[PDB]
């Protein structure tokens, strides 16, 4: 209830660049706090690249804030070295145009991870068009930048990892270990891949396009009945075992006969711990996932979003209103049925489309959670809800509602489609929140009042 | 206190005289009380009896929407003669039958198809001389000429894509909403959806970078769906809304493998039927006949949005004394030809909506006949 909603800071990017598709906090020590914004369709200076995507650094403070792009990669598409000698002419071995670089941006310490889910690449053997996906890992405040493309491997086709689209979702563990989700591996069974920054930097060898990172963790291929499950559509990290290694929470929106399910994979070795199942067909249970302790017990609790769930009004008319499920963890484990469920009110609002822990926004002793409905509100510009934590679990009524201050346009604003909270930009004891509105190429920073 | 009045109560068209009594679709009457007015006292319920009677010879329009992945080539070889066999069959059911055809495979974008030039030119193997992928194509608008359907369906080319699930929901939405371009009449509208695979739905476009939700407008240019790259797949809720709004009755003819998926889809979609299709569509005519009997033998009632303080309830008095209440009370089954059933509709108001002469409508799903209800508040 204490977010400064009467005068938030608005960041603007190039028109049509989807500026604000993903947002993240950045502070590489020395209080140099900054905001990272992804623009998957932005034009860049890379030779021969059309709409390669970009990531913007927007330092906080100094009254107005100017956003400048970061050069993760200044080079164009590589050429097939065989083509240089071949009389047929040079060929690109790689396709960076429309790669959606910056579709997901994450940071931890002075390291930044930005990924390009739509990045494609033709093998060095046969001319395929595999959308493997790629990520760039900035280290020690840009002093070193490494490419990490785990799904660019010897399994080069949709039957293998060719269509993996690694980096479709990603996250950092509290120790800095990288976690990626590829929805496409093995005929869209999906996959989760993880490696440490030390391992990546040790195995780095840029001239080998296919180069396996030693010690990498990944899930195994399964039988054909599991195809089209989209494992890794969304990922999150939390502690759900009796250890100190964060475990991977992954969404599988199309797993069980188009009923979604969310699986928690053991952090130490990537193996299944728990399963949770959706309630309605094609509700996209698992579109978004989050992990945070909402009832103050010190044990992380799980949140899952199903933005396409369909409900019926008392009158009897069916309507599309998303739903969010909360599973409280307890010392004996975590039960397979949700303790609480939150439902949207705006038709076609897609209530459970995004999630983010807010930390203890009001510093009352219980962490809070923000849920975004990109097409809610009277004008369908999108809405973000704030739900307070409590001793009995997450509250059922929002304590605050955030909406765009600007007027509606011909196109949707997608306000609330991307969220990030739990960090403080001012130095106050109160965490802040950043909301993406890529439909209008804007990102909004909300600050928690004392 | 509350009061009730009836303004239009034309009787059902039984045409018991015989076959000489031919009628236009608008002349046939199946719902008896066509108009009412109710005065409501705060907290006082008012009820009336609603009578339905199934007609005998209502016309039928059938649109055949078919998947054209390579696995359906043998299916197409059999669907070739449907334009004659199905009309011969339906002539036992209705005296006026029209048919139409359409096809679909998949969205033509990065993840769902191979985007190399060679594969865009031919998605299958060289021996399997497939044509380029396409989203949706309206081959033949609704017509009563069977030979035209036969020829046009015979001239179609098979295609293919990469991922097993197919993008047929785009085609379903376009067929539902494109109206005049397809020639729907105000008669029994049947949509036969035929395939041998799963289906994409909203949220799958994010993989290909399609984040804009389906708008539900018609986007056909030259009988081709042009915005497949621009709009995401429809959601099941959106399809339910549009199909129920446009009086489309759906028949899912799918192979044995995907019966468990399409049965749940049928449960979700009102006024739809599902049947088991052969490996090469040899029993499709019997599927259609059985599904038509199943659909036409049931009645489901719908009502529009009500004011904030108003509520409604249903009670159905079907054949053989079997009755219902709640969500089950707005439905009857086994309505044979010439059969008659009744419903009890109860309205209540708990507030005073500013003394306005409110109104709303009730109708049976799949028909354009409505019952108009006028609400007035004693305040």
């Amino acid at each position, epitope marked *: 209830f204490n977010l400064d909603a009467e005068a938030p800071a608005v960041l603007s990017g190039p028109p049509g660049s989807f500026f604000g598709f993903s947002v993240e906090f950045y502070r590489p020590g020395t209080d140099g706090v900054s905001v990272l914004v992804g623009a998957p369709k932005a034009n860049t200076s890379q030779p021969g690249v059309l709409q390669g995507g970009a990531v913007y650094l927007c330092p906080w403070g100094a009254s107005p804030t100017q956003c400048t792009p970061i050069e993760f990669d200044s080079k164009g598409s590589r050429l097939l070295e065989s083509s240089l000698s*071949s009389s047929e002419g040079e060929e690109p071995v790689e396709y960076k145009s429309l790669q959606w670089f910056g579709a997901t941006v994450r940071a931890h310490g002075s390291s930044i991870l930005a990924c390009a889910p739509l990045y494609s690449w033709r093998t060095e053997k*046969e001319p395929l068009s595999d959308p493997v996906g790629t990520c760039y890992l900035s280290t020690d405040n840009f002093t070193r930048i490494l490419e990490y493309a785990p799904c660019r491997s010897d399994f080069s086709w949709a039957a293998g990892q060719g269509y993996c689209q690694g980096g479709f979702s990603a996250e950092f563990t509290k120790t800095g270990r990288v976690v990626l989700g590829g929805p496409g591996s093995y005929f869209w069974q999906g996959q989760i891949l993880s490696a440490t920054q030390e391992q990546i930097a040790e195995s780095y060898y840029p001239e*080998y396009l*296919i*180069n396996l990172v030693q010690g990498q963790l990944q899930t195994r291929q399964a039988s054909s009945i599991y195809d089209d499950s989209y494992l890794g559509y969304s990922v999150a990290v939390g502690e759900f075992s009796g250890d100190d290694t964060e475990d991977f929470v992954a969404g599988v929106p199309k797993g069980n006969l188009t009923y979604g399910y969310v699986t928690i994979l053991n952090g130490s070795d990537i193996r299944s711990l728990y399963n949770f199942s959706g309630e309605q067909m094609a509700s996209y249970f698992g579109y978004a996932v989050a992990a945070t302790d909402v009832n103050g017990d010190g044990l992380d609790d799980l949140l899952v979003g199903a933005p396409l769930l369909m409900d019926r009004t008392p009158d009897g008319r069916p309507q599309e209103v998303g739903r969010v499920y909360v599973y409280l963890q307890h010392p004996a484990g975590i039960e397979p049925t949700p303790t609480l469920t939150l439902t949207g009110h705006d038709e076609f609002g897609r209530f459970g489309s995004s999630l983010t822990p807010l930390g203890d926004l009001d510093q009352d002793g219980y962490n809070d959670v923000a849920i975004g409905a990109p097409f809610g509100g009277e004008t369908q510009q999108g809405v973000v809800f704030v739900f307070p934590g409590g001793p009995g679990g997450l509250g059922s009524k929002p304590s605050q509602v955030l909406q765009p201050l600007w007027a509606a346009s011909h196109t949707p604003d997608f306000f609330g489609s991307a969220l990030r909270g739990g960090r403080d930009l001012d130095g106050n004891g109160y965490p802040d929140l950043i909301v993406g509105s890529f439909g209008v190429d804007k990102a909004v920073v909300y600050r928690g009042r004392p | 206190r509350g009061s009730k009045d009836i303004k239009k109560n034309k009787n059902v068209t039984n045409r018991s005289k015989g076959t000489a009594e031919k009628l236009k679709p608008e002349d046939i009457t199946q719902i008896q009380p066509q108009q009412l007015v109710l005065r409501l006292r705060s907290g006082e319920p008012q009820t009336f009896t609603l009578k339905f009677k199934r007609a005998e010879d209502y016309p039928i329009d059938l649109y055949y929407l078919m998947d054209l992945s390579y696995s359906m080539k043998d299916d197409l070889e059999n669907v070739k003669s449907l334009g004659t066999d199905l009309m011969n069959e339906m002539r036992r059911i209705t005296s006026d039958f029209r048919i139409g055809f359409g096809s679909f495979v998949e969205k033509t974008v990065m993840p769902y198809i191979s985007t190399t030039p060679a594969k865009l030119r031919n998605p299958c*193997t*060289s021996e399997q001389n497939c044509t380029s992928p396409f989203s949706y194509k309206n081959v033949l608008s609704l017509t009563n000429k069977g030979e035209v359907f036969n020829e046009l369906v015979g001239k179609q080319r098979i295609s293919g894509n990469l991922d097993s699930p197919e993008g047929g929901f785009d085609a379903i939405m376009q067929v539902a909403v494109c109206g005049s371009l397809i020639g729907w009449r105000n008669v029994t509208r049947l949509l036969v959806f035929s395939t041998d695979a799963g289906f994409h739905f909203a949220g799958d476009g994010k993989l290909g970078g399609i984040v804009l939700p389906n708008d539900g407008q018609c986007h056909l240019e030259n009988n081709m769906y042009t915005m497949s790259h621009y709009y995401d797949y429809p959601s099941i809720a959106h399809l339910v809304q549009k199909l129920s709004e446009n009086n489309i009755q759906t028949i899912f003819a799918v192979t044995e493998e995907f019966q468990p998926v399409y049965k749940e889809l049928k449960n979700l979609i009102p006024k739809s039927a599902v049947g088991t299709l052969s490996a090469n569509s040899s029993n499709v005519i019997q599927l259609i006949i059985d599904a038509y009997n199943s659909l036409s033998s049931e009645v489901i009632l719908e009502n529009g949005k009500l004011s904030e303080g108003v509520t409604i309830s249903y009670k159905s008095y079907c054949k053989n004394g079997v009755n219902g209440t709640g969500e089950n009370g707005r439905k009857c089954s086994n309505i044979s030809i010439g059969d008659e059933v009744q419903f009890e509709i109860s309205i209540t108001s708990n507030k005073c909506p500013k003394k306005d002469s409110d109104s709303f409508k009730i109708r049976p799903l799949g028909f354009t006949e409505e019952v108009e209800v006028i609400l007035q508040y004693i305040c």
Partner: antibody
Amino acid sequence: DVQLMESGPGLVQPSETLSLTCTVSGFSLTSYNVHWVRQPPGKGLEWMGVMWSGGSTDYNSTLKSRLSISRDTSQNQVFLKMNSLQSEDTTTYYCARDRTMGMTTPFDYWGQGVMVTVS
Amino acid sequence: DVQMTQSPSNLAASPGESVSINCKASKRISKYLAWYQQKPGKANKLLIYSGSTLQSGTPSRFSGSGSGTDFTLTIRNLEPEDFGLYYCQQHKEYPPTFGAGTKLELK
């Protein structure tokens, strides 16, 4: 039990077209690529061309104007047609198998080879 | 286009001994090298791929080594059937290229 078997005329005139056949067993041509390799009388192996699993073909740039590769999935047969030349006498031809879509591998199976004389 | 050069054109050894065959590439090819055996009356047989991974039927006395541009094949205890011809193929990039071959004969 994968097996690649090779056949062709043992002796051809310098002007004729040399036609060779590789008959396969234990796998379907639509799942694997079938390559053609030759070993001149006293040299190492040389790659000639490939019949991709999808039905298209690629050839060695030096021989592309002379080569022509085809297949018959019904008969499990892959054909090679070439313009003959004396200077290529007593050269041996091989057909091999490998996968490029999915789990890529080197040439995992070979034929026994056929020796062709030109006079 | 990778040129592969195989060092010993001919080798002489006696059964029970040990030998090594070296194959070198014109450019770094990571670990993607395969070794083959050719007996006079039979087809080529894959022994090792990816530098050091044995094919299922390969006897354990065969071992591969090396990475980058230099690779070597070692036969630990020569049985009389190990004598023949040996080839190295790089499987990193197309078009495929092969070494000239090495012939192993009795001492």
